[PDB]
Assembly symmetry: D2
Homo-oligomer: 336 residues x 4
Amino acid sequence: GKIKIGINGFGRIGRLVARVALQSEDVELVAVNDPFITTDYMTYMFKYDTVHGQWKHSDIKIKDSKTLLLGEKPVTVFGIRNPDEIPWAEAGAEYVVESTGVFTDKEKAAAHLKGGAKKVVISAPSKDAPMFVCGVNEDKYTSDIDIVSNASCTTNCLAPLAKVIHDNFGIIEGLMTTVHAITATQKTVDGPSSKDWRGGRAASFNIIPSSTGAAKAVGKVLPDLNGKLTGMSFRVPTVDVSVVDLTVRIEKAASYDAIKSAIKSASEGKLKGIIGYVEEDLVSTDFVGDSRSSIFDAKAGIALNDNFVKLVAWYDNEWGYSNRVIDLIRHMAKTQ
Amino acid sequence: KIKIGINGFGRIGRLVARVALQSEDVELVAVNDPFITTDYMTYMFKYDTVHGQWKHSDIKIKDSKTLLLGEKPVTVFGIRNPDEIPWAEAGAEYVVESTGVFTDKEKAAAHLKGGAKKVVISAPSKDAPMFVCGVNEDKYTSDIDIVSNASCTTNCLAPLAKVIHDNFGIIEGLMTTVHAITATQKTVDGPSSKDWRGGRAASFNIIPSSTGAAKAVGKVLPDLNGKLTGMSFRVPTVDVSVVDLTVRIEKAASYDAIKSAIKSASEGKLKGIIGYVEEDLVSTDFVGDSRSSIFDAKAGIALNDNFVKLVAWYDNEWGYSNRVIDLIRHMAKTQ
Amino acid sequence: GKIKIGINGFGRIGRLVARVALQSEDVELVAVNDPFITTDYMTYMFKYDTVHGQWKHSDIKIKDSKTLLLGEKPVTVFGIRNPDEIPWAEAGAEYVVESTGVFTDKEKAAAHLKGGAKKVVISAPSKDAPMFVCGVNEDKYTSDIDIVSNASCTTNCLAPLAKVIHDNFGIIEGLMTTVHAITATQKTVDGPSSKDWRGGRAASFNIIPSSTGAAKAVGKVLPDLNGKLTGMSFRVPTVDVSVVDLTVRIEKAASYDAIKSAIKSASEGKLKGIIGYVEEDLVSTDFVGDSRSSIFDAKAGIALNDNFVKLVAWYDNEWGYSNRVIDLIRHMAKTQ
Amino acid sequence: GKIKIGINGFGRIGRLVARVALQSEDVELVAVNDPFITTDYMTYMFKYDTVHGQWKHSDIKIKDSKTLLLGEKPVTVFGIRNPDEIPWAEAGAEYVVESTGVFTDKEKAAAHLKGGAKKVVISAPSKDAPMFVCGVNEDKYTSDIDIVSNASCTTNCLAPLAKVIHDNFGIIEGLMTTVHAITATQKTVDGPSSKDWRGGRAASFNIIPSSTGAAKAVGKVLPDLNGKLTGMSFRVPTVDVSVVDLTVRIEKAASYDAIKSAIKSASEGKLKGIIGYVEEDLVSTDFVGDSRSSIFDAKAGIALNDNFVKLVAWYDNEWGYSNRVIDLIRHMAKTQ
Ligand SMILES: NC(=O)c1ccc[n+]([C@@H]2O[C@H](COP(=O)([O-])OP(=O)(O)OC[C@H]3O[C@@H](n4cnc5c(N)ncnc54)[C@H](O)[C@@H]3O)[C@@H](O)[C@H]2O)c1
Ligand SMILES: NC(=O)c1ccc[n+]([C@@H]2O[C@H](COP(=O)([O-])OP(=O)(O)OC[C@H]3O[C@@H](n4cnc5c(N)ncnc54)[C@H](O)[C@@H]3O)[C@@H](O)[C@H]2O)c1
Ligand SMILES: NC(=O)c1ccc[n+]([C@@H]2O[C@H](COP(=O)([O-])OP(=O)(O)OC[C@H]3O[C@@H](n4cnc5c(N)ncnc54)[C@H](O)[C@@H]3O)[C@@H](O)[C@H]2O)c1
Ligand SMILES: NC(=O)c1ccc[n+]([C@@H]2O[C@H](COP(=O)([O-])OP(=O)(O)OC[C@H]3O[C@@H](n4cnc5c(N)ncnc54)[C@H](O)[C@@H]3O)[C@@H](O)[C@H]2O)c1
């Protein structure tokens, strides 16, 4: 080991990927860049979390103007806006997590290579960097690629479920709806959002529809499913945890029980850790802190017939995805 | 000149009263609720968290058993059993059964003992004839004294499905409703014997729930019996819900063809029942909308010409309350 | 014969100040500037509102890139960043409502005079522009003052109440707490807020303590109270409508009924329309749309004794204030 | 050996008092009564919680329809409405936690004795049963008392704070305000609530004033402060964690720093575990899970002068209080 990483954008995903790395045995966080959060403010934002509780694993302290100590393990802090000016090499950061939400293009994210980084993992979909979803197509990653995308948390939820359903029963066509928690891009009160008008309306007092390429993106990581899936979303007044509502038409007829057995076995086999399976009366909060990418809700789903069903799968959009960012880094690091 | 009474002065009861009191043809003459005194009733009727204060008329008490809406008298009852309510004394011909505990045909029929002539159950009934305005209210016959106006969800789903089925032919469909919280839910994790998920804190959880609204469409549109079903997700909003209907259709149709069909329907026969919008609206923009189903053109999406996802809004409280009154109007015109 | 005004910053307050003007008999909105809201987006943001309902008093349309049509009446639209670059006189705007939140300094707010504007009303506290509060000290205004502040929504609620109490009973000292709805400066989720750390935390899932000079500002508009009042604030998960909680030790002993009586008298007299009086079991949503600056809740308060009492007054922080912005302009227009 | 307790009313407090017992080393939960929660349903309500996470401390099994298995320890389950009919003795429950909220009268709670219980601790204020607050007057308890009250969560937060301020500076008089999270007695939508009209209004969409004698109650556990304190509450849209806002006029002049010091000193000494002290930018969710009764927030408070100040103290109305119920039981058992 240890695998040395840096994080650009110490936000919801940035801070949680830090918790995952800090709690790991094989990954070492060595640097964090965010020009909007000072070293001092960084210890506060990292220690306290409205959703995932207070950090109690180690002690948080400031060594100096730009060095955090987690315990004492040292973490360099940067406050640079331009990625091509971040000296990642100085801190030994081999892998950089691009979780700012503004450098998703391959060309922008590649700016990190200038300061000495060897690999960059974009914490969101990318238009030109290849996307990988763990448990679905991460084995397609080749080490000659230096900039990749870990897709969206929604694709990480739907992709695993669709692969199981497709492998077992064959998917003819499917439509997805995700009841999604509010996020950083939304507004507390009605305000401007030029590219997403509905997105500008007060987040916690409205059900706000939105478009999403998360379902269609499944066709990129699973080519056989190209053009057979798409969907949309409804952002709702909850702080975290979202759910996928997949309406699918399958080729091979199968009872609901049959579908439940296929998912259960997958959650216990090759996709253990990625896809979960519950059969209780759970609600959103019960999934806070769940590290799986997709937790199938057995009792919530409903079948119209043996070839037309609606499947339900939860996902802690912040926690599960953050764990997948790390898992993808772990796999890239084990490649070759 | 239609005289009505309301049993259960709750969310639906109070709003149905607002519609009636603001109507020219309907007259509320009596209200019954054992858990709300006459004085408290004036407060619960005047102030509303979501539909604003009532200023249409002055609200005052005359006596302990009589309210005055500006200048019209409204008798107040506090009876527990429906078969003890002297509806006729107040001259109430139609009784809106909105308590939520008397949906059985035989239980609602209790209002007839007090002299009521017809009863309209503000909810689905296991055995009472069901009618949805704009869908099958014309199947109503004057010999029927007890009917169901179905659920707000079914009122949203039914009209829409009828338009798509008649134009395009729905082979199969699955619906999900993102629904506002209601009175049956809890503020904090509490006991809900018949619905565990529903006992969990209402405004701090996405809460899955089962719904018969989709299956009930089969009762008002026979050709869709067994062709639809679904579920629901209760979310942290105070009112206004939305139906997401995914359907496979017989006749191939572009999304634009589907939009115009709905738009046409909204400007014709179903005008006032089904609405059509093509703006970036959100939930609160629908508070106070009297339609049963408001199609969101921009929210919906189609995978191909035979498989699509349609989105329709509905103020579960206000639109339904209006339908309750519309059914009464229709029944009253039925010889 | 109308007072021609313009609005810089088409936000919560700018948009509602616009609703008030458009429906008035004496003020005419002739121009609005907001570099973040295009002309067509402006018609959408103005028409629909999560808290105050849809605009139905008149039709809304776009005459041209650059002109709106509010019930057959034209409103010029600008999208200029720098205030000194706004051609207000072109639109004929005599009064400018500075509601962007970023130009509260008297010398920054004065940039509007460059474009031909004659008077500027800052919709917020100002460190160097004088503050006036309707019902408290607006008559102190003289026509040679060209830049003024309408204070804060909280001071507009606190000032009138404090005045009545002080004039009748004499305030020895007081401490205020405002349980305030969330606003645009807050975040949907745990986000950066360098000047107000607490204010960065998820808005609708936390009680959030906050500093405020609203009680201290009372000294500016009411000299004899200078230094005798101060306070704090808690931001809670509501969309609009706030409440002031004033605890005061008074010089003249008075029963709670006598205190209630003084406030009622004022609400029916000199302070009608500014201070309101309620004796019913109301809650926050019952005040949405109330135009008063301070609605005294007679039942919610409690006195420990005849010289120490806790008084409660509600205020639609958005609507009440917006109406006061207009009332101040009307007053200034009548001066000299 | 172990203090064997029984719980009547498996609600928020009842279930969290159970978690505390089940995690202690000295307390043994042996019986639970709740006629509205079946034995099977009980495991589900006990295991998952919207606020305090999933119970992971020990496994949960159902031995049969009358008993649960928690970490191999049997817990009898009753479903009896009338308290006088619960055979506490049969289970071995010595102390009974009366947490239904309907049997707070001394004579009504005494019903638990006819079934075999020796002591009854009511988890709410009582009109006549002796009230005790750990760290304030729990030593006033005498073995001849079999039925006591552990006061309210609010009085538990305020009393310890007032005791410290009074012992150090002397409290001449004070007025309190509590910004409180919603509770089970409130309603999801505007519904009937005859004894509390405001409390019938939509809980998560309104700021709801409410009366409260939690402040007047301090004079009960703290005789010297009788008639020196009172106040009221504001229920707001949060799921848990409330805060006390105390405005007090003190006798001995003290700078804010000296007051902070006195509180920090008490939090590290005699009142350790009861009173807490924080000097950071925290928000409500940061206190979820805190076991103290009162957490002083140094930075949130403000002083007008050395004799008139506003003190802020947080409390997880659910958790802090549940821990104190166990502590009161511990003290009673230790003073048999
Ligand atoms: N929140 C989720 O549920 C979720 C799940 C999966 C993927 N994502 C994706 O992760 C990304 C970040 O999402 P988030 O919710 O954590 O956002 P966020 O807003 O919480 O965090 C983004 C961080 O980027 C920082 N930042 C801004 N400009 C910067 C710059 N030039 N250099 C360095 N740092 C900068 C910000 O100060 C902020 O702390 C987005 O692309 C998002 O779509 C989010
Ligand atoms: N709220 C909605 O969105 C909605 C929409 C459509 C249909 N419905 C249906 O309407 C019914 C009521 O729903 P709601 O949300 O208005 O509920 P609610 O709880 O707000 O109102 C029900 C009222 O019934 C009263 N009541 C109880 N027992 C009574 C009795 N024996 N006699 C007289 N009155 C009595 C209550 O005191 C209460 O005021 C239910 O069957 C519900 O499923 C609700
Ligand atoms: N919302 C309230 O409760 C309230 C009440 C009283 C006073 N205020 C004060 O009013 C001001 C605005 O508050 P708000 O809640 O309406 O804020 P907001 O964020 O809703 O609106 C501010 C508007 O300013 C625009 N803007 C930004 N930069 C600009 C520029 N250079 N030129 C022109 N427009 C620009 C934005 O695009 C936005 O639409 C603040 O100073 C605030 O303190 C707010
Ligand atoms: N934050 C808080 O919620 C808090 C803090 C301090 C004190 N308290 C007090 O604790 C008590 C309970 O409050 P809660 O919030 O836990 O309420 P809750 O409604 O969550 O729980 C009460 C439980 O009592 C059960 N119950 C009802 N009648 C019963 C009977 N006859 N026999 C046995 N069980 C019965 C219910 O089924 C329910 O599970 C109240 O007196 C309250 O004032 C509450």
